[PDB]
Design a protein around this motif. Structure first.
Motif, mmCIF file in Angstrom:
data_model
loop_
_atom_site.group_PDB
_atom_site.id
_atom_site.type_symbol
_atom_site.label_atom_id
_atom_site.label_comp_id
_atom_site.label_asym_id
_atom_site.label_seq_id
_atom_site.Cartn_x
_atom_site.Cartn_y
_atom_site.Cartn_z
ATOM 1 N N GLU B 180 -49.249 10.760 24.882
ATOM 2 C CA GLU B 180 -50.655 11.205 24.923
ATOM 3 C C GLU B 180 -50.719 12.718 24.810
ATOM 4 O O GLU B 180 -51.772 13.166 24.509
ATOM 5 C CB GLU B 180 -51.329 10.721 26.203
ATOM 6 C CG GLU B 180 -50.874 11.448 27.458
ATOM 7 C CD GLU B 180 -51.130 10.656 28.713
ATOM 8 O OE1 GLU B 180 -51.590 9.476 28.588
ATOM 9 O OE2 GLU B 180 -50.869 11.211 29.807
ATOM 10 N N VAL B 302 -56.483 9.678 31.021
ATOM 11 C CA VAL B 302 -56.389 10.994 30.343
ATOM 12 C C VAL B 302 -57.716 11.234 29.628
ATOM 13 O O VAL B 302 -58.212 10.298 28.972
ATOM 14 C CB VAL B 302 -55.155 11.070 29.412
ATOM 15 C CG1 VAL B 302 -55.078 9.934 28.393
ATOM 16 C CG2 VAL B 302 -55.095 12.409 28.710
ATOM 17 N N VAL B 314 -59.541 7.811 29.605
ATOM 18 C CA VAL B 314 -59.091 6.488 29.081
ATOM 19 C C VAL B 314 -57.654 6.247 29.524
ATOM 20 O O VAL B 314 -56.955 7.193 29.883
ATOM 21 C CB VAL B 314 -59.279 6.399 27.550
ATOM 22 C CG1 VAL B 314 -60.762 6.494 27.181
ATOM 23 C CG2 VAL B 314 -58.509 7.465 26.791
ATOM 24 N N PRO B 315 -57.190 4.978 29.486
ATOM 25 C CA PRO B 315 -55.836 4.625 29.927
ATOM 26 C C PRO B 315 -54.755 5.328 29.080
ATOM 27 O O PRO B 315 -54.889 5.416 27.842
ATOM 28 C CB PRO B 315 -55.801 3.093 29.772
ATOM 29 C CG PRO B 315 -57.272 2.680 29.823
ATOM 30 C CD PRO B 315 -57.962 3.797 29.064
ATOM 31 N N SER B 316 -53.721 5.837 29.760
ATOM 32 C CA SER B 316 -52.387 6.106 29.172
ATOM 33 C C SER B 316 -51.848 4.820 28.515
ATOM 34 O O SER B 316 -52.120 3.710 29.046
ATOM 35 C CB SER B 316 -51.466 6.622 30.250
ATOM 36 O OG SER B 316 -51.914 7.877 30.728
ATOM 37 N N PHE B 317 -51.094 4.972 27.426
ATOM 38 C CA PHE B 317 -50.699 3.920 26.471
ATOM 39 C C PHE B 317 -50.113 2.705 27.214
ATOM 40 O O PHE B 317 -50.575 1.575 26.939
ATOM 41 C CB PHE B 317 -49.723 4.480 25.428
ATOM 42 C CG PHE B 317 -49.497 3.564 24.245
ATOM 43 C CD1 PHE B 317 -48.507 2.585 24.275
ATOM 44 C CD2 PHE B 317 -50.314 3.639 23.126
ATOM 45 C CE1 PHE B 317 -48.320 1.734 23.200
ATOM 46 C CE2 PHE B 317 -50.141 2.769 22.057
ATOM 47 C CZ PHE B 317 -49.148 1.811 22.103
ATOM 48 N N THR B 319 -50.192 1.827 30.311
ATOM 49 C CA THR B 319 -50.911 1.445 31.548
ATOM 50 C C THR B 319 -52.081 0.551 31.173
ATOM 51 O O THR B 319 -52.566 0.672 30.037
ATOM 52 C CB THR B 319 -51.303 2.707 32.319
ATOM 53 O OG1 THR B 319 -50.087 3.461 32.419
ATOM 54 C CG2 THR B 319 -51.842 2.412 33.690
ATOM 55 N N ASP B 320 -52.472 -0.337 32.083
ATOM 56 C CA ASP B 320 -53.747 -1.082 32.004
ATOM 57 C C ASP B 320 -54.637 -0.708 33.199
ATOM 58 O O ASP B 320 -54.142 -0.543 34.331
ATOM 59 C CB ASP B 320 -53.487 -2.577 31.858
ATOM 60 C CG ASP B 320 -54.690 -3.320 31.310
ATOM 61 O OD1 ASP B 320 -55.702 -2.650 30.941
ATOM 62 O OD2 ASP B 320 -54.616 -4.552 31.285
ATOM 63 N N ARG B 322 -58.739 -1.177 34.914
ATOM 64 C CA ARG B 322 -60.016 -1.929 34.997
ATOM 65 C C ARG B 322 -60.795 -1.435 36.197
ATOM 66 O O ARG B 322 -60.160 -0.949 37.165
ATOM 67 C CB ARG B 322 -59.754 -3.419 35.229
ATOM 68 C CG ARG B 322 -59.289 -4.141 33.987
ATOM 69 C CD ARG B 322 -58.912 -5.590 34.272
ATOM 70 N NE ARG B 322 -58.160 -6.049 33.111
ATOM 71 C CZ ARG B 322 -57.338 -7.104 33.073
ATOM 72 N NH1 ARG B 322 -57.145 -7.854 34.144
ATOM 73 N NH2 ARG B 322 -56.673 -7.366 31.961
#
Lengths: 481, 481
Positions: B180, B302, B314-317, B319-320, B322
């Motif tokens: 990222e 990030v 938004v999420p790091s690649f 990671t998930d 919610r």
């Protein structure tokens, strides 16, 4: 997210950079958001066509958005991707399709005739773009890093063997690239080598997508079109083998092309001749030379822009590399052994070939089949392919060394050095040469010249001249001689 | 290589960039080759002092080469690193040392008095530099990615809990950073925030070492010294929280400092006030704002330089993320829920606290304790800490929202909003304010002003003025009121 593998990548990247251009091919431009929806439509259509977890989906076509759509859609359907070598004839494709047990083959239109001619028993043969459903909601199937992502066939230089590259294998190769190479989010990567080999897929294409850059696909390698692309598209990153960089640098547009955009030239295959590196260094350009193989997904050794000519370089961060004796014992400083490779990039094994796998993969160490030495700075030097070795008297000849000298000699366009039976010495060498455009090459003179350059026992006893050498396929040469 | 964890990193990086500067601290400069030999000397000396696989080695000191030497040496000895918060008093250090069961504590000289005062029962207390053996051959113990690398203690804002961060947790966080963020091999990273927190260790220090850059360690945060460092050392990469970037930008040398070297400003903690972002944007500088937590090693969300103020991004690649309802059910578009986090960066659990672990970690999903919403573009907005919520009548008050307005009001240096008992409503809010340098602040006027800015039910019923607010520790405030 249940899908840990490449199937998930379009979804993960669309959350980060949805409107960035992922992929360019002729007219086509795909954002990450459009790539993800296309992948999900293809995953739904694979499932509707009967694709279940573990099934194989083949792709026969060139570099093309469809290649990437099929790769990612397979992962998203929990399937195994099989990128077929698009230059094979029908019996070789039949062999790869039966070995893989592919249940679906997707192809571009240029291959419709070949595809009609295949043993279509229990194989769905379908043009690219047809299986796509209208449903673009991504699937989230359980996929682990140890699950097989794709089968990449060896040359079979015996029958070709399907290297089982896991989701983990290709993910950790991308991690190795990211650690050892400087890629940014604005990368513009030209992919003019085939995505059906690990080099273009693993070293350039996947890392660029992971970084949210742009993959520019050329269906064919044309040095003229590559130079135009570099300057019109502002290419930052390229992959080739020296033959490609040679043809680019030989093209008449080389002199006047704007090459200022280029940040990273990755060079795979053979090491770069000092003449080629000089031509490139003249325009501020230096090669990142990589060594590796399909079974390492493929990155093993890297030689960055810092100065040892011939060297294959040093291990990628997550990989371990050694020169080993025939029983795995590490070899004395500077002595020849076989490169052996360990790490999370190294393949699960060869698809349905466990015994062949065990001859070359044990304790997570892969036998490269490359003879090499390591210097006191940990730098690796590839001598030759172990299988090409010639035992003459009690001594090892390495054709590649003899061949290297032979290419010094005026009017040698191509050459190979094979073993032939010798009553007295078990084997001796024979050189086999293609002479250049109109050159009077005397075999006696060439053999004499070679003798002045090498230990006696390494000098081939004979030369034979041909116009055609079977590509660079030793073993075919061993037949024609 | 048997060691897959951080212990191996100095060995892997010394094969690639042995003579590049890894670490600078005052006079000290360490190459990767010298860092690796120092680590191996410390690993041998840990073993000779009785350290065995799984044992804990604590470090009490500031940012210092010794921090990194101890981290890597622990990994190389198969031990668990415990970086202690260096501002704790003796009873708190005693608690972290008994909870961790550390058998060795290494400390810098400034802590010799504190260290003499600890319950030294079954603890080797030793100054930095003393355990080092003369043997610099790296050990290769078997260490998996699921093995614990370090224990990082929570604030305990109950008793502090040891977050178990695996070798895998910190490795995959570094992978997320690399995907990222644009780091290169020539990165020069200033670490002026404490390495005993995951933010400086995971977001800046480890990724820079992985990339073969230079980590510049400041033992203390001094805005003057940071500005000097940026321009003399040509710093490319910095980590801080907004308070640090604020003090830097408030220093008289700000105007005349050369800031042209800076490529990446990572900002953790609170979001950046639009005034601070304006001051930085005036000099071509924009913040990469990260959201995360110790238990995520720590990267979760990030927000890059592309434009939604307030958002955590938004999420790091890998990671998930919610927003979940109280029973994990995902929440209606735009409605408030708790951020929950999954991925290979998420902790194994809290050291010897399985029940506390199960309240917050299940099915690889970690309960952040943060209330938030997600917009239609997948962007996250942190409302508040769930534990700080006030239920007044039937309705939720979120102190942070009330607090945000209160900071609009002239002469409010610091403020906190707590629940107090209400006969009629269960709880109501009370504001607690520190007034600025000589300001006549009228509580009736402030309460009236607040009422014009918020729904009635969110307005505190009372204000109280103090000179000192316990750092930003709600719960301490709930005592003093």
């Amino acid at each position: 997210m249940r899908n840990q593998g490449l199937g998930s990548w379009p979804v993960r990247r669309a959350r980060m950079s949805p409107h960035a251009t992922a992929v360019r091919h002729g007219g086509t431009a795909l954002t990450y958001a459009e790539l993800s929806r296309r992948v999900a439509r293809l995953a739904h259509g694979l499932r509707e066509a009967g694709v279940r977890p573990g099934d194989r989906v083949a792709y026969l076509g060139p570099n093309h958005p469809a290649y990437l759509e099929t790769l990612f859609a397979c992962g998203q359907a929990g399937a195994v991707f099989v990128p077929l070598n698009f230059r094979l004839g029908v019996p070789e494709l039949d062999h790869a399709l039966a070995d893989s047990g592919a249940s679906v083959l997707i192809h571009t239109p240029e291959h419709a005739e070949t595809v009609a001619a295949l043993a279509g028993d229990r194989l769905l043969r379908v043009p690219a773009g047809e299986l796509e459903a209208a449903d673009d909601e991504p699937l989230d199937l359980p996929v682990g890093l140890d699950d097989v992502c794709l089968l990449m066939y060896t040359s079979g230089s015996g029958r070709p063997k399907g290297a089982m590259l896991t989701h983990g294998n290709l993910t950790w190769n991308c991690v190795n690239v990211l650690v050892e190479t400087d890629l940014a989010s604005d990368e513009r990567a030209l992919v003019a080598a085939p995505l059906f080999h690990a080099a273009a897929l693993g070293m350039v294409c996947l890392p660029t997508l992971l970084k949210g850059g742009t993959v520019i696909l050329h269906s064919a390698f044309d040095p003229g079109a590559v130079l135009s692309a570099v300057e019109q598209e502002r290419v930052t990153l390229v992959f080739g083998v020296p033959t490609m960089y040679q043809a680019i640098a030989a093209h008449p547009r080389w002199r006047s092309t704007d090459l200022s955009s280029l940040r990273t030239l990755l060079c795979g295959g053979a090491p770069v001749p000092a003449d080629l590196a000089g031509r490139y260094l003249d325009r501020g350009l230096a090669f990142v030379q990589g060594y590796g193989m399909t079974e390492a997904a493929p990155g093993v050794l890297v030689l960055d822009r810092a100065e040892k000519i011939g060297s294959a370089g040093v291990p990628s961060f997550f990989t371990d590399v050694r020169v080993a004796g025939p029983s795995g014992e590490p070899v004395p400083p500077g002595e020849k052994g076989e490169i052996v490779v360990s790490g999370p990039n190294v393949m699960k094994g060869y698809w349905g070939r466990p015994e062949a796998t065990a001859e070359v993969l044990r304790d997570g160490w892969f036998r490269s089949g490359d003879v090499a030495t390591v210097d006191g700075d940990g730098y690796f030097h590839v001598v030759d392919r172990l299988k090409d070795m010639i035992i003459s008297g009690g001594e090892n000849i390495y054709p590649a060394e003899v061949e290297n000298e032979l290419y010094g000699y005026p009017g040698v366009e191509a050459c190979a050095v094979i073993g032939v039976p010798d009553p007295r010495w078990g084997e001796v060498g024979k050189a086999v040469v293609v002479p250049a455009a109109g050159s009077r090459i005397d075999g006696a003179e060439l053999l004499a010249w070679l003798r002045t350059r090498l230990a006696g026992y390494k000098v081939p006893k004979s030369v034979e001249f041909t116009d055609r050498l079977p590509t660079t396929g030793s073993g075919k040469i061993l037949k024609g001689e």
